Amino acid sequence: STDIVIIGGGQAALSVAYYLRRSKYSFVMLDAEQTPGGAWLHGWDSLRLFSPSTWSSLSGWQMPPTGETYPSRDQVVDYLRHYESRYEFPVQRPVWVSAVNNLGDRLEVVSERQQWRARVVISATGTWRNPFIPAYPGADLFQGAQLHSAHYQSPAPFAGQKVLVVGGGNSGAQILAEVSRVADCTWVTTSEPIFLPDDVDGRVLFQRATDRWKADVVMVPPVKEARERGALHAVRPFTRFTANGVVWADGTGSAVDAVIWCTGFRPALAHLQSLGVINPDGKVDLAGTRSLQEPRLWLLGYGEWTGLASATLIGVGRSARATAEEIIQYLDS
Amino acid sequence: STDIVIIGGGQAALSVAYYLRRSKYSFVMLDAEQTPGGAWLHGWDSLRLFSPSTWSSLSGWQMPPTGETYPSRDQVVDYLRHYESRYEFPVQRPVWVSAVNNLGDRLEVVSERQQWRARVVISATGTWRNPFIPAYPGADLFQGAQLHSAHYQSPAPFAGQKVLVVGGGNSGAQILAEVSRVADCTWVTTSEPIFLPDDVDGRVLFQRATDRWKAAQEGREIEQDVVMVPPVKEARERGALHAVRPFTRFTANGVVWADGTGSAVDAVIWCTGFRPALAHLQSLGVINPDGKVDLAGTRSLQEPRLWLLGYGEWTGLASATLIGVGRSARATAEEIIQYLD
Amino acid sequence: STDIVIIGGGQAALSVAYYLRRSKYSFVMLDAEQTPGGAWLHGWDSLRLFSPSTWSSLSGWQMPPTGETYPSRDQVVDYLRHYESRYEFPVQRPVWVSAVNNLGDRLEVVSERQQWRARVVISATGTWRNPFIPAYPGADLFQGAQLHSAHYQSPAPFAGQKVLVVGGGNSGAQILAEVSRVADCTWVTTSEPIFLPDDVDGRVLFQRATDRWKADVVMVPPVKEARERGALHAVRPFTRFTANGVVWADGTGSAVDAVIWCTGFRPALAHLQSLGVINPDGKVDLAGTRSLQEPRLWLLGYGEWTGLASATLIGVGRSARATAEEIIQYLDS
Amino acid sequence: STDIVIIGGGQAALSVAYYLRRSKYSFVMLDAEQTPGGAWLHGWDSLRLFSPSTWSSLSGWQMPPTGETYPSRDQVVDYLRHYESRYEFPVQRPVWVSAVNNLGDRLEVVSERQQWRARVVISATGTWRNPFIPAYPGADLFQGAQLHSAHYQSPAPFAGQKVLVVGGGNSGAQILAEVSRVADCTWVTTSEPIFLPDDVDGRVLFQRATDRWKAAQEGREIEQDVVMVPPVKEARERGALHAVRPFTRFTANGVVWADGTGSAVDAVIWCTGFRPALAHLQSLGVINPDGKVDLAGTRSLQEPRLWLLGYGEWTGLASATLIGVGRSARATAEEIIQYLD
Ligand SMILES: Cc1cc2nc3c(=O)[nH]c(=O)nc-3n(C[C@H](O)[C@H](O)[C@H](O)COP(=O)(O)OP(=O)(O)OC[C@H]3O[C@@H](n4cnc5c(N)ncnc54)[C@H](O)[C@@H]3O)c2cc1C
Ligand SMILES: Cc1cc2nc3c(=O)[nH]c(=O)nc-3n(C[C@H](O)[C@H](O)[C@H](O)COP(=O)(O)OP(=O)(O)OC[C@H]3O[C@@H](n4cnc5c(N)ncnc54)[C@H](O)[C@@H]3O)c2cc1C
Ligand SMILES: Cc1cc2nc3c(=O)[nH]c(=O)nc-3n(C[C@H](O)[C@H](O)[C@H](O)COP(=O)(O)OP(=O)(O)OC[C@H]3O[C@@H](n4cnc5c(N)ncnc54)[C@H](O)[C@@H]3O)c2cc1C
Ligand SMILES: Cc1cc2nc3c(=O)[nH]c(=O)nc-3n(C[C@H](O)[C@H](O)[C@H](O)COP(=O)(O)OP(=O)(O)OC[C@H]3O[C@@H](n4cnc5c(N)ncnc54)[C@H](O)[C@@H]3O)c2cc1C
């Protein structure tokens, strides 16, 4: 029976925890992973961030520099691990929160073995656990291998395969870049993908949304190398799957052994279905981070819908600070 | 490492289990509840079915008869309890399945303490755990009590309250009927609610969809409501089933209607229904934009080792009813035995 | 060679014309119809507005009252006719504007027989001429009659037919109500339709957006009568057409002789394609009424995207006044 | 009241007309231009094709040869003029078709002064009249000159200017090549542009899509750029084909790039291409959300008395080219003669 339950223990949770720990109110953080790390523990082997440590730091404690390379997955995990420990956050892991229940004057946060009664709940569960794969005509038929980027690890199993990498943006480009080295790939995208200039990192992502808060594909090394191997040519979605291929709009067929779906993610709010707050679009209605339908619930770190850049290391701090503030207001009054 | 994992242990799971247990293939059933009973364990005190035991029976073993008329919640729980035990289904409870993962040639069904590798997964998790409450302007402001029908228990806490019962169909009518006796209620509905004739039960629900399933099967063309259970009939006689149309917004302690007038509201009981409770399938990527899965019959198009059973009209006409879930449950079992053979 | 060309001569054009005519600057209005009236000239026979004349008036001159009935189509046409004449707007009709061309320091507004050089263009062409019919699998096959609400006139040709009325909101309900009297109808809608209370008119539409600017189906008589004949039951979209029917999700077939598509309209900006300003969504990017890409172009009266309630008689005046203001500013400076 | 109305009178219209004129059925061609020529009448002064006359010929009558290499705009206009006249196509010009209306058993094709009742409509209106300019933050502010390639004529007005040529592919490269000589240009492109080898013309465009049409026909599986025309080659030699990536926003007299640096820009030539010019089909309700029509081949699914020809890859591989439009034009004629028979 604590004041604030933070569901999830990734960078967003950590961020809001940084801003609450000095306050009066109790909190616990529940996270589904074995160790610290958030979704980063499930990045592919070669995954690196698209901006340096300085543009990939949570509030307070900057990510330690990395030597001549954008931060690696393990390095991000490390930093979250150390960050969590540095500020001595009380995180219970592994814990799967199945539901958040309105018991009247407390919310109940429920897992298999334990429940927590709370005055406030912050849902910071990210997106990784809710990957999106669009349904195409023929999916029933397609015998070949299918793997969402969430679960992409290494290009080895795709060695020699006819592979479709599906979905634009950074994951598709980074995965294509890697898998095109060992397999014959086609990048399928809904729109012609748009690249940043070679000399700017994903900082420009943060910065664009700082301009918008004052009111596109990063050319990371592998992706740059893939341009040089003439492998970033994208095409438009196919019309349907066949048993071992796809048919494109022009009526032609192609063989496909494997599709890597880099089609992104939805907010992983399963644990909020019990609250009735999940809107038709699979999100929650918010003002800022705050649930309109349930104002003791805050949602943090999910995407543009919870705050410009909130689903980034550098960016999640604005809305995390503001969430902490609004929550401290709520609980004072 | 079994052949079929049935996620959930409500009447739908039971139904498909009845049809697989005689086969060669292994299965286990995982269910979230403490005991047998499915969502029925969470019905309100006075909840009764809208059709007799004969029209509320799973395959094989009929529900034992009940007096005067209509089976009670406990009686339905009882029958599921006994049904499960009668056919000796191996159900692990309580188990919360958090995700279904594609490991290549097995699906992994995952809970906190245990995982199961399976050749086939049947998701029969119902809707109760995914109640729907529509957002209205002002929900942020509304200080008064809010309770979805999922959690409605008894009218006692609403004693004397100004209550909105929101949402038509059977739950709203049955809850209104009960809560109007002790509180001042307004039934708010998107459309004028439509009542069945007083002398027909929810059997007509089943029957309509049998006509429509005779139609789809045979190939013929066809075309295209509140049961008057006792309490609901009584509520008509107390002139209490007058419904009005949605308000425009909440205020801190009321709602403002379209005409601009305000009303005080202490409590809103949302009888606005439920979505399919497929949280455990988000990990599979199969959840479509409408929060469902794309199916042919019960079968997942995107993931054909996954079947979905018992959720609603979208998994089969009448599949989300005791009597009705058996068609699609038999056909799921058949299709699954085909797949594995 | 005038200062302002107003393309289109419906209520939106009229509205902005009311606000410019007292100013210094010249303007002409070009409209495609034979007579005054805008899209109203193409309403079905029984079409009436969903709110009284007082809640269906343009600026200045109120619509004359109507006796115990919401204003009729002819009455709206009449009022536009008289309104246009009352303020002596110079409207050239019939004139089809095919394109708006950037000639440097003038825009050129082009029709077959005439061109106009202008400092400013206001596009107030409404939506009627750009009806939307969604494509369903099987449309190629469907032999039966098809008619968008734009062209619906009377229920007589549907006499005895198996009819699908497709699309919710007011047109579907009003057309269903009428056609269900003489044909066997199914109302197909993407979502369960939501009715206003019986004693409130489409004024509540205006009012909702006045609340939002300070910051759903009207039960018109026929539609009320149709509820009483138990005919407003809606169902969800079918999955596909067959040659003489549709197949629903449950796999069942139904015979359909006729589909009336009440699936609405897009903005009728064909004449702006030449300007390059039509965004991917088939609209123009705006601040208020003003084209971002082409700031001598204003768009008025189209929908929520040009202004809350701007596509209504009562509502179009806010954004029409503001357009006139912004245009008078532009041309002074 | 004719059988077939062909809307538009460019090379696509001509092509399908070649294939219908020997048939029994009447047709008329309506075209918006003052003279024959299609969009070619609006090409820039120095515009030449990217492949020789032999690879730029419509069906039947080949384009007459040209010296040194590559047919000029006037030469293409000429050939369309003569082609139209040679086969005596009845083309009404200038006629702007504003809408195509379904009157039941005829389609009505409408212009200001005249209407035509038709059993079949072929929309062959190209893309030129629907140029695309993407919106960037700051477009409201940008005071400097803006000109889509559609209207580019000559580099003279850009003399000495700081110019952005926006958009890759052939137009941007050809316009840059010309304007870089007289102005200070930056080529802005979404991706690094890719050049064909110096010794191959836009024939390779046709040929790629013949391989792909041999593939679709025969049923085999297959898989899935700037021609180095003379001026463009010259521009490489002047080191002027260096492209950069889109800027982030316009300012009043410049752009700000991603790195945060600013540049002055007097003029932007948008070589960002074209959409299908189907305005006259909005009235039919057939325009899909992507601004196209749903087709099987050339044929409208929603309105099967409507065919669309010559627009791009979506109406047929290479159909928006002189050499390429003939496959789909023959097949359209065939399908239309079938329909009417
Ligand atoms: C492929 C990829 C590349 C990216 N690259 C970058 C980059 O270069 N720079 C950048 O700034 N951002 C990047 N991001 C974005 C973002 O920083 C990561 O997505 C990060 O995972 C977001 O952290 P989070 O805390 O919002 O979500 P997560 O890291 O997912 O944290 C949520 C935590 O909550 C847990 N959880 C979920 N549900 C429950 C439950 N019911 N009960 C208990 N725990 C639960 C999860 O297991 C997880 O441990 C990238 C994202 C992806 C997918
Ligand atoms: C108010 C109301 C009245 C109704 N009245 C009738 C009636 O009169 N007659 C009739 O025939 N039908 C009626 N129904 C419909 C239907 O019979 C019930 O909804 C019933 O619960 C459907 O059974 P099910 O097995 O499909 O779903 P459920 O009964 O919910 O069973 C699914 C089981 O799966 C479990 N589960 C969910 N998620 C997980 C997970 N991740 N891991 C493990 N287990 C999980 C649930 O806890 C539950 O135990 C009614 C429904 C409602 C809401
Ligand atoms: C079925 C229906 C019912 C409605 N009911 C109501 C109601 O009850 N109350 C209410 O307030 N609103 C109602 N509306 C909304 C709105 O008031 C009407 O749509 C009205 O038509 C909008 O007027 P407008 O001037 O924006 O558009 P329009 O009336 O279409 O005016 C545009 C004019 O521009 C012309 N035009 C188009 N393109 C060109 C071109 N290229 N060159 C020259 N001229 C051109 C058109 O022919 C037309 O004459 C309704 C709309 C519909 C469709
Ligand atoms: C810069 C550029 C370079 C190109 N170079 C080559 C090349 O080298 N080789 C090659 O093979 N192809 C080339 N193309 C492609 C193609 O040959 C041209 O686009 C050509 O115009 C396509 O012919 P069309 O008949 O399909 O379209 P169009 O030539 O535009 O003809 C359509 C006709 O219909 C008319 N029209 C439009 N709307 C209406 C209406 N509502 N009513 C009546 N008439 C209407 C138009 O005015 C036009 O006269 C090029 C295209 C561009 C833009």
Residue numbers in the entry:
A (entry chain A), C (entry chain A): 13 to 227, 243 to 360
B (entry chain F), D (entry chain F): 13 to 236, 243 to 359
From the paper:
FMOs typically employ the phosphorylated nicotinamide cofactor NADPH to reduce a molecule of FAD within the enzyme, which then reacts with molecular oxygen to form a (hydro)peroxy flavin species that is the catalytic oxidant in reaction. Natural variation within the phosphate binding region, and its influence on nicotinamide cofactor promiscuity, was explored through the cloning, expression, characterisation and structural studies of FMOs from Cellvibrio sp. BR (CFMO) and Pseudomonas stutzeri NF13 (PSFMO), which possess Thr–Ser and Gln–Glu in the putative phosphate recognition positions, respectively. The structures of CFMO and PSFMO revealed the context of the phosphate binding loop in each case, and also clarified the structure of the mobile helix–loop–helix motif that appears to shield the FAD-binding pocket from bulk solvent in this class of FMOs, a feature that was absent from the structure of SMFMO. In order to shed light on the nature of the cofactor binding loops in CFMO and PSFMO, the structures of each in complex with the flavin FAD were determined to resolutions of 2.39 Å and 1.83 Å, respectively.
Crystals of CFMO grew in the C2 space group, with two molecules ‘A’ and ‘B’, representing one dimer in the asymmetric unit. The CFMO dimer was made up of two monomers, sharing an interfacial area of approximately 1207 Å2. Analysis of the CFMO structure using PISA found that the interactions that stabilise the dimer included six hydrogen bonds, including those between the backbone nitrogen of Trp108(A) and the side chain oxygen of Glu124(B) and the side chain N—H of Gln320(A) with the backbone carbonyl of Ile145(B). The monomer of CFMO superposed with the structure of the SMFMO monomer with an r.m.s.d. of 0.77 Å over 317 Cα atoms. Each CFMO monomer consists of two domains, an FAD binding domain and the putative substrate binding domain. It appears that the residues for which there is poor electron density are part of a flexible helix–loop–helix structure, incorporating helix α8, which is found over the FAD binding pocket, perhaps shielding the active site from bulk solvent. There was substantial residual density in the omit map in the putative active site following building and refinement of the protein atoms of CFMO. This was successfully modelled and refined as FAD in the flat, oxidised form. In the case of CFMO the side-chain oxygen atoms of Thr202 and Ser203 are both orientated towards the putative phosphate binding site. CFMO was observed to bind both NADH and NADPH with increased affinity compared to SMFMO, as illustrated by Km values of 3 and 5 μM compared to values in the range of 24–27 μM for NADH and NADPH, respectively.
